[PDB]
Design a protein around this ligand. Structure first.
Ligand code: K
Ligand code: K
Ligand code: K
Ligand code: K
Ligand code: K
Ligand code: K
Ligand code: K
Ligand code: K
Ligand code: K
Ligand code: K
Ligand code: K
Ligand code: K
Ligand code: K
Ligand code: K
Ligand code: MG
Ligand code: MG
Ligand code: MG
Ligand code: MG
Ligand code: MG
Ligand code: MG
Ligand code: MG
Ligand code: MG
Ligand code: MG
Ligand code: MG
Ligand code: MG
Ligand code: MG
Ligand code: MG
Ligand code: MG
Ligand code: MG
Ligand code: MG
Ligand code: MG
Ligand code: MG
Ligand code: MG
Ligand code: MG
Ligand code: MG
Lengths: 158, 205, 79, 81, 129, 123
RNA sequence: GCUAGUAGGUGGGGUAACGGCUCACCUAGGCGACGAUCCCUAGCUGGUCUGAGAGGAUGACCAGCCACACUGGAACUGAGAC
RNA sequence: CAGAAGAAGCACCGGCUAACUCCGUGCCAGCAGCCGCGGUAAUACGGAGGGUGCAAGCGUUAAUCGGAAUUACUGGGCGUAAAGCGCACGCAGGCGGUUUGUUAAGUCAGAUGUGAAAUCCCCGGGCUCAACCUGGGAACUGCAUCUGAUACUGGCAAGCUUGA
């Protein structure tokens, strides 16, 4: 039911009196392929434990995205820390034209066609955060009409 | 300009049957299909995303017998043509004369259909065509030449063809050894084990 | 009708001649900002009516000297 | 003088002439005043092998343009439909 | 010194929405009133009124839907340092048509869709989304 | 920068200098070896790398690496050089083309033969 | 900072033709930080390569325009050439 | 007509980057675009077996754009990463509160002329296919002129008081 993807595993270190203690971090995303997506970040002495923790957090941190037939509603910009991302809808058959970190998020969320670009820092943790922020801030015609007190036809008419 | 090596190694690398043999036997009884070729073939291949895209593209290429320059040209044409690029690419591949002959059943394999086309045994709308990459238009008629109607391999291919699923976009008469290309096959009429969006993404890398 | 320019007299010290500055308002090709440009023309001024600062009116004609190919029509405004 | 002639285009062994009006001094495939038609000598059956703007040709002839022999033959064939 | 009252009006709207103000008040002008009319017609603001004779004051009543400001973003486009004019065939689309662009045409201030229907270009005053 | 400032002084592109100036934008250049010798690499590497000081047909005098195991180059040998820096060798910006002019190929080479000018063995 | 035929005017001459094109006289002007003058490089365009675009780079082949013809200079003939 | 008969190579395989083992060597010989590799159990040097990618080509070098939002118009920055003149006054320049009228320069609309052909793109046609050739269109985002629109910017005239 839920598609899970491991985006990056990194080895970090802290120094103690006897020397360096290594550990691992895992960044993952989960999604239902129908507008729900979440990301998890886990730390452990071992890679499988870190990955399991990340999946556990991702399953709990899901948000909702208003998709339009497997594409975005409109161009969106997202930002987190040094990472800036830009995404726009594309015609059917275009595919996911995006870098790896954005691609995992978009694919588990269920975006099938999109043109994307990452500016600034391409650190995967912050790129994932910026991508999810843009998707969560995307608007749909229903929301726009409701908030403006108009009808969907008046929003998208002549 | 044509792959001339062992055929089952390609299917073993791609992890599936590519219909590179006639089908009189089983791919499992002819080869270790579940195992990749070579000394290290038993290893579990961890594939990156680029590896997955590349393997999908190579699978389609090996199925249709097309080399890289021609396939890239096909992709460029598919992107240029209106509509869904992956579906356009699949339609362009299915429009090839050798593939049309194989689907009509005059060749046991696509390689055999290609040899039949090359050796001037195939006619399109009453003219001899020996170009394997010739594009077959709708309402076109593909027929076996009269001097080649006596070949036993054509009859063997015809009796092997009905053992498989009949293409619904063609209309074949085996008595006269001739068929009509009624229309371009839709995406539904093609195999569901082909992910053309992987190829489309690969050619954007 | 006849194509015609309008400008401001910046010099009149020549005999029967004046220098007229014509201002154009054009969009910068790269940055899109509308900027002012100036072209200076030598104009034939018979009777030496024009003075420095007057807003004058000019048209194109045959060459009259090395640098003169324009001639004065009327004085729109006098300084 | 002004003349109406054929400029050879197309490919090797497969010529395709453009019927053009030109100052006769210019090179055969060079500067021309106005294109008035075309002539394909290897045109297949059911394909238009010759097309001429007879109104423009007559206008230029009235203005004083001469006509090459091949273009005159083409005009005769076109008029003899 | 003050050199763009329109950008000032837009900023007052933006900051008031951010501060959850019921209404925002500013010195009035005919262009500001025309822009306010477009905003009200499109439903981005609730109402507006002009009070006073010698020093007219424009008040705009802001709206909130579910605890969130209706004006998600409002941005000056043409500005004194750089004027922006667009022809009818190149009128911008805001948020893939979900937002509006306020355009000053020879037939008055209207949205980009209205200018497209009238077949007119003009000056792109601002984007609202 | 504001648009006024850019109108006054436009953005300036930085010119990039070539890392192979002695080639003068040619794919190769012919030279005559004035010296053939060995040299030691920069740390953390250690070896006796084979180089030659060569005077080119355009008058440039440069140092060129001699790749491959063993070579037949000496003073007055006429060689062809191509672009390519040797990271651990200080100021060696060019590579000798093995198998061109007086430079022979590498003996008993079976893999990557075209990179060292070795003909296909008759096997 | 540059310019004395230099900028303009009158008259004569000259050209197929307007014109400091040339000559005599008079006026003291003309160009220039919206870059004159000087120095370095360069045939120009339709186009070509790249790029999502905006741009960046480029001007071989084909076609339009220009310039040159061992080097420097000159005219003759001619509808047209220096 | 005859007979599979006359017709396959090149680069790569530690990561980026698709593809792994043995033997030889032992900071040597050597590799290398970068990270780096080589010190006696080297998937990085050299050979072999196996494999990967292209294929009558394959690699290398040179050179341009890209990736480079790394000159940022679209589309960047300046407390501490590079970056606010030591502080001012002020010419040129850029910018300009509010109302009415007028003008129509900017701006907008339409039309006309031009924007050579070829090239690019779309729909077709002919070479067995394709490259290639070719019909028509679209485009040439520009310039000029004419006729209109007057909200906004500019000019002109008259004001107003909230900036000064
Ligand atoms: K790390
Ligand atoms: K397509
Ligand atoms: K004169
Ligand atoms: K070392
Ligand atoms: K002179
Ligand atoms: K004179
Ligand atoms: K004179
Ligand atoms: K371009
Ligand atoms: K250009
Ligand atoms: K000369
Ligand atoms: K050993
Ligand atoms: K900027
Ligand atoms: K106007
Ligand atoms: K006005
Ligand atoms: Mg080929
Ligand atoms: Mg003159
Ligand atoms: Mg030169
Ligand atoms: Mg770019
Ligand atoms: Mg040239
Ligand atoms: Mg000579
Ligand atoms: Mg004469
Ligand atoms: Mg000459
Ligand atoms: Mg790999
Ligand atoms: Mg070993
Ligand atoms: Mg090796
Ligand atoms: Mg750039
Ligand atoms: Mg920066
Ligand atoms: Mg410091
Ligand atoms: Mg600092
Ligand atoms: Mg200070
Ligand atoms: Mg001050
Ligand atoms: Mg004002
Ligand atoms: Mg054209
Ligand atoms: Mg047209
Ligand atoms: Mg006004």
């Amino acid at each position: 039911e839920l598609q899970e993807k491991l985006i990056a595993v990194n080895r970090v270190s802290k120094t103690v009196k006897g020397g360096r203690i290594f550990s691992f971090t895992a960044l993952t995303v989960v999604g239902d392929g129908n507008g729900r997506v979440g990301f998890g970040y886990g730390k452990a002495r071992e890679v499988p434990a870190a990955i399991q923790k990340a999946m556990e957090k991702a399953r709990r941190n899901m948000i909702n995205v208003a998709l339009n037939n497997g594409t975005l509603q409109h161009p969106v910009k997202g930002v987190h820390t040094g990472s800036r991302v830009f995404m726009q809808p594309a015609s059917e058959g275009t595919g996911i034209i995006a870098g790896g970190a954005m691609r995992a998020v978009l694919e588990v969320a269920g975006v099938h066609n999109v043109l994307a670009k990452a500016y600034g820092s391409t650190n995967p943790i912050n790129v994932v955060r910026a991508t999810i922020d843009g998707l969560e801030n995307m608007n749909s015609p229903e929301m726009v009409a409701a908030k403006r007190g108009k009808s969907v036809e008046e929003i998208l008419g002549k | 300009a044509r792959y001339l090596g062992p055929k089952l190694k390609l299917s073993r690398r791609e992890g599936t049957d590519l219909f590179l043999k006639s089908g009189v036997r089983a791919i499992d009884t002819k080869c270790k299909i579940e195992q990749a070729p070579g000394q290290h073939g038993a290893r579990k291949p961890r594939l990156s995303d680029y590896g997955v895209q590349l393997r999908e593209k190579q699978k389609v290429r090996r199925i249709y017998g097309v080399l890289e320059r021609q396939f890239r040209n096909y992709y460029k044409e598919a992107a240029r043509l209106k509509g869904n690029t992956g579906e356009n690419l699949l339609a362009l591949l299915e429009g090839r004369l050798d593939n049309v002959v194989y689907r009509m059943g005059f060749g046991a394999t696509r390689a055999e259909a290609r040899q039949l086309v090359s050796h001037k045994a195939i006619m399109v709308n009453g003219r001899v065509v020996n170009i394997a990459s010739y594009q077959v238009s709708p309402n076109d008629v593909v027929s076996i030449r009269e001097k080649a109607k006596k070949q036993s391999r054509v009859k063997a291919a015809l009796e092997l063809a009905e053992q498989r699923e009949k293409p619904t976009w063609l209309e074949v008469d085996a008595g006269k050894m001739e068929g009509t290309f009624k229309r371009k096959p839709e995406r539904s009429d093609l195999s569901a084990d082909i992910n053309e969006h992987l190829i489309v993404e690969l050619y954007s890398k | 009708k006849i194509r015609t320019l309008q400008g401001r007299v910046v010099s009149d010290k020549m005999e029967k001649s004046i220098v007229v500055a014509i201002e154009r308002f054009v969009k910068h090709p790269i940055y899109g900002k509308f900027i002012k440009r100036t072209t200076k023309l030598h104009v034939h001024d018979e009777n030496n009516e024009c003075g420095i600062g007057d807003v004058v009116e000019i048209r194109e004609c045959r060459p009259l000297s090395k640098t003169k190919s324009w001639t004065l029509v009327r004085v729109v405004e006098k300084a | 003088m002004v003349t109406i002639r054929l400029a050879r285009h197309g490919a090797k062994k497969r010529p395709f002439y453009q019927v053009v009006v030109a100052d006769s001094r210019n090179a055969r495939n060079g500067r021309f005043i106005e294109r008035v038609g075309f002539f394909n000598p290897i045109a297949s059956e059911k394909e238009e092998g010759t097309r001429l703007d007879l109104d423009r040709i007559a206008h230029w002839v009235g203005q004083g343009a001469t006509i090459s022999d091949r273009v005159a033959a083409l005009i005769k064939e076109v008029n003899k439909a | 010194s003050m050199q763009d009252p329109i950008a000032d009006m837009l900023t007052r709207i933006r900051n008031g929405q951010a501060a959850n103000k019921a209404a925002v008040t500013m010195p009035s002008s005919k262009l500001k009133v025309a822009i306010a009319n477009v905003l009200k017609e499109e439903g981005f603001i609730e109402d507006f009124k002009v009070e006073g004779d010698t020093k007219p004051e424009l008040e705009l009543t802001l709206k909130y839907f579910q605890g969130k400001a209706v004006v998600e973003s409002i941005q000056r486009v043409s500005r004194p340092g750089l004027r922006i004019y667009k022809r009818k065939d190149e009128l911008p689309k805001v948020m893939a048509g979900l937002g509006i662009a306020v355009v000053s045409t020879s037939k008055g201030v209207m949205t980009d869709r209205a200018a497209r229907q009238a077949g007119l270009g003009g000056e792109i005053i601002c984007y609202v989304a | 920068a504001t648009v006024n400032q850019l109108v006054r002084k436009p953005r300036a592109r930085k010119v990039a200098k070539s890392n192979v100036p002695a080639l003068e934008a040619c794919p190769q250049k012919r030279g005559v070896c004035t010296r053939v010798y060995t040299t030691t690499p920069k740390k953390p590497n250690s070896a006796l790398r084979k180089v030659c000081r060569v005077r080119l047909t355009n008058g440039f005098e440069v140092t060129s690496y001699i790749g491959g195991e063993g070579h037949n180059l000496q003073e007055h040998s006429v060689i062809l050089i191509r672009g390519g820096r040797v990271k651990d060798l200080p100021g060696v910006r060019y590579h000798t083309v093995r198998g061109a002019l007086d430079c022979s190929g590498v003996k008993d080479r079976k893999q990557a033969r075209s990179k060292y000018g070795v003909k296909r063995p008759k096997a």
